[PDB]
From a paper:
To tackle these questions experimentally, we designed a set of constructs that had either 6 or 9 residues inserted between two consecutive GCN4 N16V adaptors, based on two different sequence motifs. From Actinobacillus OMP100 we derived the constructs A9 with the full IENKADKAD motif and A6 with the shortened motif IENKAD, as well as the ‘control’ construct A7 with the 7-residue motif IENKKAD. The GCN4 N16V variant can form both dimeric and trimeric coiled coils and was chosen for these constructs to test for the oligomerization specificity of the inserts. All five constructs were resistant to proteolysis by proteinase K, showed typical α-helical CD spectra, did not melt upon heating to 95°C and yielded well-diffracting crystals. The structures of all constructs were trimeric and could be solved by molecular replacement, using the trimeric GCN4 structure as a search model. Apart from A7, which carries a heptad insert, all structures formed β-layers.
α-Helical coiled coils are ubiquitous protein domains, found in a wide range of structural and functional contexts. The structure of coiled coils is understood at a level unrivaled by any other fold. They consist of at least two α-helices, wound into superhelical bundles and held together by a mostly hydrophobic core. The seven positions in a heptad are labeled a – g, where positions a and d are oriented towards the core of the bundle and are thus mostly hydrophobic. We find that they indeed break the α-helices to form short β-strands, which associate into a triangular supersecondary structure we name the β-layer. β-Layers are found, also repetitively, in natural coiled coils, where they form regular fibers with alternating α- and β-structure, a protein fold that has not been described so far.
Author numbering:
A (entry chain A), B (entry chain A), C (entry chain A): 5 to 67
């Protein structure tokens, strides 16, 4: 093929691949956000358990 | 340089950079999957601790 | 427009979009690293709570 057609085809292929990757990145970003939310909730559930365990230790006099 | 050579070089550089980024995205996706698994396990370990703490509170009569 | 100008413009647009995506990927990688650290800490906080709960169960004789 002539070089101009070659180039047009390679550029179009790149445009489609960049679009596909941009959609994947976006999806990974949203997945990360959801995971970050779950980790923040886990941090709070753990802190609550730490306080409940401390209170049980005080009740039974465990140092 | 002539514009056709310029373009061919810029396109090749883009192809290599898009490949490199596609491999990075793929790697980030797999890392996310593994992390999601660890977070699901943490959710279960926390729920189990919540049940064990509740049962201890009942045993000692802690409201 | 002539095809050479067309191509130069499409290539420049691709270069800018690839740069933008590379910066997003990099940012997602660093966010993942920070999240992985928080998950490793959560794993340790959970293990510690499991040991504290086990010790409380032994103290009160709960099987």
């Amino acid at each position: 093929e002539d070089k101009v057609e070659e180039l047009l085809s390679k550029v179009y292929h790149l445009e489609n691949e960049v679009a596909r990757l941009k959609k994947l990145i976006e999806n990974k970003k949203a997945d990360m956000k959801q995971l970050e939310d779950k980790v923040e909730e886990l941090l709070s559930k753990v802190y609550h358990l730490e306080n409940e365990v401390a209170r049980l230790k005080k009740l039974v006099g465990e140092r």
